[PDB]
C-alpha cells in the first residue's frame, strides 16, 4: 500500500507542495507525465533517492531502486566488487551473494574482461550488468525507467522473456515515452503536470490527456 501524506519537496518553483494521493493495491501502475514537469522528482523520491522535506510515503512492502542507473557503479571498481558491495548493503548471506554474483555473471555473458573497472568499460556491457544486477534482487515493484536491454534482437527478446517470468507474480512500474509497452503491460495511469496529478483507470483517457494538455 503506497500512500502519500502531504509531500513537499523544494528543488524557486515548488514542484510538489503538501498534496496527498492514494494508489491502487496489486494493480499494474506506471508513472507517466511530461518530461521535466516533476515526474523525475516523483520517481526518484519513490525509489528513495531523496526524502521529502514534508510528508511521507508509506508502503508495507519494500521498493526496488530504479533500474539502469550507470551512476550507481563506482568507476575504479569492476562489476564483481560493485555487485558484492550492493548486496552487502542489502545484507545478503554468503551463499546468497554467491548465487547473486553467479546469476549476474551468467546474465552478463562478459566473462572475458569481466573484472574490468567502469573507467575502461563500454556502454553495452555496462547496461547488461546493470540490468542483471537490477534483476538479481527479489522485489515486487520494479521501477523500470529506460528500455529493457541493450544489444541485438535476442538480447531484448530474452530480457523480455525473463522479465515476464519474474513480473507475472509481481507488479511492475514503467516510466517511459512509447505507449505500446504501456498498453501491453500497464493497466492504470497517473499523469503529473506542474505538481497536479490525475488518475485514469483506462489509458484511453490518457491518450486524450496527452493529445490535449501536452
Amino acid at each position: 500500500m503506497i500512500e502519500l501524506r502531504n509531500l513537499t519537496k523544494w528543488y524557486r518553483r515548488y514542484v510538489f507542495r503538501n498534496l496527498n494521493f492514494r494508489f491502487p493495491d496489486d494493480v499494474s501502475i506506471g508513472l507517466i507525465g511530461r518530461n521535466g514537469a516533476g515526474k523525475s522528482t516523483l520517481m526518484r523520491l519513490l525509489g528513495g533517492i531523496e526524502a521529502p522535506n514534508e510528508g511521507e510515503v508509506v508502503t508495507d512492502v519494500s521498493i526496488s531502486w530504479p533500474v539502469g542507473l550507470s551512476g550507481g557503479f563506482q568507476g575504479s571498481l569492476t562489476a564483481r566488487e560493485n555487485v558484492k558491495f550492493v548486496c552487502r548493503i542489502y545484507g545478503t548471506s554468503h551463499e546468497d551473494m554467491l548465487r547473486k554474483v553467479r546469476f549476474v555473471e551468467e546474465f552478463a555473458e562478459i566473462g572475458e574482461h569481466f573484472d574490468l573497472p567502469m573507467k575502461t568499460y563500454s556502454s553495452g556491457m555496462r547496461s547488461r550488468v546493470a540490468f542483471g544486477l537490477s534483476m538479481a534482487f527479489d522485489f515486487d515493484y520494479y521501477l523500470i525507467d529506460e528500455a529493457m536491454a541493450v544489444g541485438d534482437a535476442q538480447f531484448r527478446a530474452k530480457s523480455r522473456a525473463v522479465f515476464d517470468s519474474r513480473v507475472g507474480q509481481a507488479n511492475m512500474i514503467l516510466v517511459s515515452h512509447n505507449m505500446n509497452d504501456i498498453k501491453e503491460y500497464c493497466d492504470v495511469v497517473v499523469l503529473v503536470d506542474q505538481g497536479q496529478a490525475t488518475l485514469y483507470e483506462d489509458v484511453e483517457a490518457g491518450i486524450a490527456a496527452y493529445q490535449g494538455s501536452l
Partner: protein, 255 residues
C-alpha cells in the same frame, strides 16, 4: 530491519570499497604509506641530529620525531582524505541506504586503522633496534590521541560540507596544511623559541596536542606555560558541533 544494522552494513561496505580503491594494484599504496615516515626520519635526522643533541640531553631524535610526526600524519590524513569523500562517491547516493556522512566516517575509520597500524609497527621497530618504545602515561596518551582524532575528523567533515562546490577552497587548504606542519613544533622542540612569538603559537590546538602526547610518552618531559588540554578539547567539541550542524542544514543538497 533495525535502523542501526543498515548503518553498520553500509559502513562495512563503504570501508571495503574505499580500501579496495585506495590500495592500487595488489596493495601498492601500503609501501608508499610505509616509506613516507622513514624518508622523513632520514632527512630530518641527517639535518638536525646535532641540533637536537644541543637542544636537550634527555631524548634521542628518532623517537621524538616519530611521536611528533605520526600523530601529525594522522591529523593531516584525517583533514585531506575526508573532504574528497563526498564528491568522489557522488554516484553512490542512489541506493536508498548511502548518505553523505557514511562515506565520511568510513574514510575516517580507514585512516584511523592505517595510521594506527603504521604507528604500531614503527614503534615496534624502534623498540627492536634499541630505542625507547614504552610510554610512561598510556591513558593520557590515548586521551590526547582521541581528542586529536575527533578534531581532525570534525575539521574534515566541516570542510567537506563547506567546500562541496568550491574545489579551489580544497586547493588552498591543501596549500595551507604545509605551514601547519612547520608551526606545530613537529620537527624541532618548541621551547627554543623567543617568548614574543609564544602567545601567537598558543592559538594552535595541534601544537597543544602534540606537546601533551609527547609529555605523556616521554618521562619527566617538561611542559611550558599554556599547554592545557582544555583549549584543544573545547576547539574539537565546538568544531564537531559546527560541522554536524552544517551537515544537518545542508543535508539534501548532496545530489
Amino acid at each position: 530491519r533495525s535502523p542501526w544494522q543498515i548503518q553498520q552494513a553500509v559502513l562495512f561496505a563503504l570501508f571495503l570499497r574505499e580500501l579496495k580503491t585506495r590500495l592500487g594494484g595488489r596493495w601498492l599504496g601500503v609501501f608508499w604509506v610505509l616509506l613516507e615516515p622513514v624518508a622523513h626520519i632520514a632527512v630530518m635526522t641527517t639535518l638536525f641530529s646535532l641540533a637536537h643533541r644541543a637542544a636537550m640531553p634527555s631524548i634521542e631524535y628518532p623517537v621524538f620525531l616519530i611521536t611528533g610526526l605520526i600523530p601529525f600524519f594522522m591529523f593531516r590524513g584525517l583533514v585531506t582524505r575526508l573532504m574528497e569523500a563526498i564528491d568522489s562517491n557522488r554516484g553512490l547516493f542512489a541506493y536508498r541506504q548511502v548518505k553523505p556522512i557514511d562515506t565520511v566516517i568510513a574514510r575516517a575509520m580507514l585512516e584511523i586503522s592505517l595510521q594506527s597500524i603504521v604507528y604500531l609497527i614503527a614503534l615496534g621497530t624502534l623498540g627492536w633496534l634499541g630505542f625507547h618504545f614504552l610510554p610512561v602515561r598510556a591513558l593520557e596518551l590515548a586521551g590526547v590521541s582521541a581528542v586529536l582524532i575527533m578534531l581532525g575528523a570534525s575539521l574534515g567533515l566541516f570542510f567537506a560540507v563547506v567546500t562541496n562546490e568550491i574545489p579551489q577552497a580544497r586547493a588552498i587548504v591543501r596549500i595551507s596544511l604545509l605551514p601547519l606542519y612547520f608551526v606545530s613544533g613537529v620537527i624541532f622542540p618548541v621551547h627554543t623559541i623567543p617568548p614574543q612569538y609564544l602567545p601567537l603559537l598558543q592559538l594552535n590546538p595541534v601544537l597543544h596536542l602534540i606537546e601533551l602526547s609527547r609529555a605523556s610518552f616521554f618521562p619527566q618531559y617538561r611542559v611550558l606555560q599554556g599547554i592545557n588540554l582544555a583549549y584543544p578539547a573545547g576547539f574539537a567539541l565546538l568544531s564537531l558541533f559546527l560541522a554536524l550542524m552544517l551537515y544537518r542544514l545542508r543535508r539534501h543538497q548532496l545530489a
